[PDB]
């Protein structure tokens, strides 16, 4: 069972490397680690378990964040009211197309690997298409918009050694871009 002590912190070099593509099929050990990543998000979102084990709530986790330099991510976004939820373990995910139009969380972003908050809007694509493999090496294409697009782009940044705060404007951190949609 993963906990916060498994999450490496900003400054750890693994967070700034470029994660490696996986060969398919995955090793038993690789499956186990991807299931535990999802299991972490599930645990962090249960108020009892998260309290008992001191978990920060998460909707996304990339393997580099537990110091494994490999291109797999977990996303767990619970139903918010839409009837739409997102429960995805992805191998070698890749953004293949996206909108020109940007979007931003008006609160800015947070990160399990970042102990402090950094203020500033992080502009991303409002709409993306992703090709990935699932845990069994089958093919997945995701068409995502808004909150889920932002989450997946955040997790994929991790695989290219990019950190949310790198996108924050230096002089005008809270300046929305022209026609950017607020989520
Ligand atoms: O540390 C991570 O990579 C997981 C982040 C991802 C994220 C943060 C901000 C914006 C998009 C993605 C955590 O999931 S943030 C914590 C959280 C948990 C439940 C509800 C809202 C926020
Ligand atoms: Ni993060």
Swiss-Prot record:
It catalyses: N-terminal N-formyl-L-methionyl-[peptide] + H2O = N-terminal L-methionyl-[peptide] + formate. Fe cation binds at residues 111, 154, 158. InterPro entries: Peptide_deformylase, Peptide_deformylase_sf. Disulfide bonds: none annotated. Coiled coil: none annotated. It holds the Pfam family Pep_deformylase. One of its GO terms (molecular function) is peptide deformylase activity. The active site is at 155. Its EC number is 3.5.1.88. Its cofactor is Fe(2+). GO terms for biological process: co-translational protein modification; translation. The keyword Protein biosynthesis applies. SUPFAM superfamilies: Peptide deformylase (SSF56420). Keywords: Hydrolase, Iron, Metal-binding, Protein biosynthesis. Binds 1 Fe(2+) ion. The keyword DNA damage does not apply. Removes the formyl group from the N-terminal Met of newly synthesized proteins. Requires at least a dipeptide for an efficient rate of reaction. N-terminal L-methionine is a prerequisite for activity but the enzyme has broad specificity at other positions. Belongs to the polypeptide deformylase family. This is Peptide deformylase. It comes from Staphylococcus aureus. The lineage of its organism: Bacteria, Bacillati, Bacillota, Bacilli, Bacillales. The gene is def.
